[PDB]
Amino acid sequence: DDFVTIEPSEKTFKQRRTFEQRVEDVRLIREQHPTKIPVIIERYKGEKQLPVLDKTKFLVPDHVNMSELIKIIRRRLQAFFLLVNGHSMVSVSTPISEVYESEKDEDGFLYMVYASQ
Amino acid sequence: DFVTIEPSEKTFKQRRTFEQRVEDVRLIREQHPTKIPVIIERYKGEKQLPVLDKTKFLVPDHVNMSELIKIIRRRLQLNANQAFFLLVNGHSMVSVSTPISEVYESEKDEDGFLYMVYASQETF
Amino acid sequence: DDFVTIEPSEKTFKQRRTFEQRVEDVRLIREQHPTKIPVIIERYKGEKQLPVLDKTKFLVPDHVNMSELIKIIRRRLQLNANQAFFLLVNMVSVSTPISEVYESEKDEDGFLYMVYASQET
Amino acid sequence: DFVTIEPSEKTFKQRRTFEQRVEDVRLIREQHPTKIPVIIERYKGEKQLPVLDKTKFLVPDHVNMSELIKIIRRRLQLNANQAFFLLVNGHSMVSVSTPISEVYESEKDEDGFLYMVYASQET
């Protein structure tokens, strides 16, 4: 009745922050952490089996391959797909720095979604 | 805000189960029957040589330790004046004339990989 | 309380000077210094760990080899021995005199181009 | 009229103790030997220019003041016509071609930081 629904989060990262805000975000973190890759990791739009994670923004050291990042997200989530830009599978031995070079967004973030296989 | 990931400092062996590594060796043997699977990493306390990016190597059966030493020396861009040691299983010093197929059958790990570590002279 | 590292202009040498300009730069410096090799040394585009070099254009005596050049640039960047620095031409033998590397690896414009990174690639 | 809200604002030196700052520098010296630690703040009575996104900077040794001025003008997103002065210890350096590593050796503060203030007027 008189209860208020207090909650996050209707919108994704790109919907909650403007392009100019995201560009400056990436600039600052790359200037402060030059050897880390800024990764946005969100739940796939359709997903309902896997749970939502507390945090969506990750600083990933250059040399960590996708396999270790997948393991880290698996543990944080407590059949798993980590899809770059919402659709792309990458070889799990690719270092995150190489994924960044080829798949980074125009805003400078690297976007990934996780989803049940 | 941002979650900072601390990278694992585990070696190749520590990152994979025995089942996984034995399977790896089998597949390598299937697809590369004339190659020795060699894991080469930096000596744990090394301070006079940098870390190489690649640690997983496929080495032809017929070469000697000297040829493998020269290949890794060149990846490191080392000078002739610069001492360099390749320790099998982190502690075994092999005659450079020894064929690698011989080092493999004699020093390979239980998992089927041949493990080596590289170090400078100042480390000793 | 985290520092911001500043970067000066990161336009590459080939973006800063046209082909015709670079050919003329080489013609002039080679007639001025016939025993020296004109070398362009630049940080790899993806490299962030190593600092940017203060200069791009180097005149390297004919007899100096890559091993000595690497030592000199490592000192210019104030690197410690355990820090990775890999210097790639446009890998070549580090004992070869740069005059011989120049003859076999020089660019169409007459410069010898090198790039450095924290990985051997 | 308008009510002018004027609250005091702490500078970097008022936010961090000398022992905090002097150790920050000594450590930056170890980790970034080719860089100069610079504090850049807006002049307290500045009436035109906006606030810079950050205060603590590492500047490569070879960058001269002319280059640094161009970099900060870009960070502030200024029009070309907007006046901008980058004052080292409150004064403009006559040579804008001296490497900041040399500026550091004559202008650093006791804590090891090199302090700059920017303003739209040189006096």
Curated annotation (Swiss-Prot), chain A:
Q: What is the effect of changing I41A?
A: Decreases C18 ceramide binding
- For this UniProt entry, what is the primary localization, expressed as one broad class? membrane
Could you tell me the superkingdom of the organism this chain comes from? Eukaryota
Membrane topology is: Lipid-anchor
Q: Where in the cell is the protein located?
A: Cytoplasmic vesicle, Autophagosome membrane; Endomembrane system; Mitochondrion membrane; Cytoplasm, Cytoskeleton
Tell me the protein family, please. Belongs to the ATG8 family.
Name the record gives this protein: Microtubule-associated protein 1 light chain 3 beta
The organism encoding this protein is Homo sapiens
* Upper taxonomic lineage: Eukaryota, Metazoa, Chordata, Craniata, Vertebrata
Gene (UniProt): MAP1LC3B
